[PDB]
Amino acid sequence: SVLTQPPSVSGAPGQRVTISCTGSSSNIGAGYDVHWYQQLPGTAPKLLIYGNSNRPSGVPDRFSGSKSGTSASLAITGLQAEDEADYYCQSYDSSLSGSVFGGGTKLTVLGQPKAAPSVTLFPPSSEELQANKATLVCLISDFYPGAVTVAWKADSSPVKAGVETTTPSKQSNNKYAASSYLSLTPEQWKSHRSYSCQVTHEGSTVEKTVAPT
Amino acid sequence: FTVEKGIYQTSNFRVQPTESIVRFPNITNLCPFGEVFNATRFASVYAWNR
Ligand SMILES: *[C@@H]1O[C@H](CO)[C@@H](O)[C@H](O)[C@H]1NC(C)=O
């Protein structure tokens, strides 16, 4: 809205990373103090620094807050193993008659190497045919990272309806697994000759097909 | 001290203006500031709008 933030910022583990926050002349440039918060994906945000002059208890001294007139800046020294969150600007807005937050910056560069994926295609069982639906599942497991595109074909034309893709989650041995469903009906399931799922990972494309008859 | 008949040019006539107008525009622009007073609700005295 009234506060704009960059989408992402790049840095190195050992140099200085500085973020710039720009607003208006009635919320931050009027004279109001600014507050910075960290939005960890899964935990409630906490207070980092208020007023850019005092240090709250439990907060390290590596975080520095300054207000260069209409713009506020935050600087850090060294990238540790907990900076994988979002930084926001909080200031009182007279026009909005309340507190308004910023956009949010993501702090990550690269932590995902490559691996070799493996897929499995399982046709629906006999009890699924009488439910007036056909859920075609093509599971993908043991791959890294979790960025796989899913394409469905019926050996004559690609299927662009009912295609879904779930987000992958970390396995026990630091890998990723995913599944893809396809909503169909048993009326046309038997008419088609075969069904398959096609995926591509870093140029490696594998294909598995099943025959209902 | 003796002037004969004829035409004679003595000085020059200059019409000095008495008033000056220097107004360049007809009106100047404005900025949105009436919303400070024309508002649905106001703030309090411990935390007022700046
Ligand atoms: C506020 O609203 C009134 C009526 O809508 C209008 O006459 C006036 O010019 C506006 N601005 C101020 C500063 O009062």
Three-state secondary structure readout of chain A: CCCECCCECCCCCCCEEEEEEECCCCCCCCCCCEEEEEECECECCEEEEECCCCCCCCCCCCCEEEEECCEEEEEEECCCCCCCCEEEEEEEECCCCEEEECCCEECCCCCCCCCCCEEEEECCCHHHHHHCCEECEEEEEEECCCCCEEEEECCCCEECCCECCCCCEECCCCCEEECCCEEECHHHHCCCCCEEEEEEECCEEEEEEECCC
Residue B35, classed as helix, strand or coil, is helix
- Number of other CB atoms surrounding residue A74 within 10 Å: 21
C-alpha dihedral (A70, A76, A77, A83), degrees to nearest 10:
-160
Chain A hits for B49, Cβ within 8 Å: 94, 97
Task: Give residue for tokens 């439990």.
Answer: A58
Best residue in A25, A91, A95, A100 for a mutation probing chain B (most B CBs within 10 Å): A95
Find, among A21, A29, A1, the residue nearest to A96 by Cα.
A1
Q: What domains appear along chain A, each with residue ranges and CATH number?
A: 8-108 (2.60.40.10), 118-210 (2.60.40.10)
Ligand 1 binding pocket (C-beta < 6 A) is B 34, 37-38
The residue contributing the CA closest to ligand 1 atom 6 is B38
**DSSP secondary structure code for residue B16 in this structure:** -
Q: Chain B within 8 Å of A32 (Cβ-Cβ)?
A: yes
| Six-digit token string for A53 | 């002059």
What's the farthest any 2 CA atoms get from each other in chain B? 94
Best residue in A94, A96, A99, A100 for a mutation probing chain B (most B CBs within 10 Å): A94
| Six-digit token string for A159 | 């299927």
How far is the alpha carbon of B30 from chain A, nearest alpha carbon, in Å? 17
What angle is formed at CA A37 by the lines to CA A31 and CA A40, rounded to 5 degrees?
165
Stated length of chain B: 50
B50 in Cβ contact with A94 (< 8 Å)? yes
A208 in Cβ contact with A196 (< 8 Å)? yes
Taking an 8 Å cut-off on Cβ atoms, the answer to whether B35 and A26 are in contact is no
Method: cryo-EM
CB pairs under 8 A between A and B: 12
Measured in angstroms, the resolution is 4.0
Give the span between the Cα atoms of A126 and A190, in whole angstroms: 13
| Six-digit token string for A31 | 């004279």
